[PDB]
Structure 1
Amino acid sequence: GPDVFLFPPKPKDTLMISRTPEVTCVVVDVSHEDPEVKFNWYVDGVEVHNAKTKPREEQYNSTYRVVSVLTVLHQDWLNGKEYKCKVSNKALPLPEEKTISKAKGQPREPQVYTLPPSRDELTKNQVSLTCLVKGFYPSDIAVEWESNGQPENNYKTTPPVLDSDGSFFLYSKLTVDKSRWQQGNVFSCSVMHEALHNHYTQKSLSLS
Structure 2
Amino acid sequence: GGPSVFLFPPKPKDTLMISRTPEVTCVVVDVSHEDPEVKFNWYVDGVEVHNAKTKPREEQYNSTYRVVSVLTVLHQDWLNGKEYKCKVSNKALPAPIEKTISKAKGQPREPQVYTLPPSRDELTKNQVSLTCLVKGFYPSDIAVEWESNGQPENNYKTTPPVLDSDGSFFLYSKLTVDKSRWQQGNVFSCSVMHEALHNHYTQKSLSLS
TM-score (structure 2 length as normaliser): 0.97
* Deviation digits for residues 31-52 of structure 1 (CA, Å, limit 9, x no counterpart): 1111111111011111111101
> More displaced, 75-84 or 156-165?
156-165
Q: Alpha-carbon deviation of 1:94? A: 2.0
Structure 1 ranges of 4+ moved more than 4 A: none
Instruction: Give the length in aligned residue pairs.
Output: 208
Greater Cα shift, 183-192 or 157-166: 157-166
| Distance in 1, Cα, partners of 2:48 & 2:190 | 41
1:86: Cα distance to partner? 0.8
Corresponding residue of 2:66? 65
**What whole-Å deviation, never above 9, does each CA across 1:91-129 have from its counterpart, x for those lacking one?**
012211111111000111010011111222111111110
Q: What is the TM-score normalised by the length of structure 1?
A: 0.97
CA distance in structure 2 between the aligned counterparts of 1:138 and 1:3, rounded to whole angstroms: 29
Identity across aligned pairs (percent)?
Answer: 99
Of 104-113 and 161-170, more deviation after overlay is shown by: 161-170
Unaligned runs of 5+ in 1: none
Deviations 1:16-74 (A, max 9, x none): 12211100001111111111111110111111111010010110100000000000001
Name the CA distance, whole Å, in 2 between partners of 1:158 and 1:3: 32
1: distance between equivalents of 2:165 and 2:66?
41
Report the secondary structure of 1:189's partner residue.
Answer: strand
Answering whether residue 179 of structure 2 is matched by residue 178 of structure 1, we say: yes
Once the two structures are TM-superposed, the CA of residue 76 in structure 1 deviates from its matched residue by 0.4
Unaligned runs of 5+ in 2: none
Tell me the CA shift for residue 183 of structure 1: 1.3
Q: Tell me the SS of whatever aligns to 1:144.
A: strand
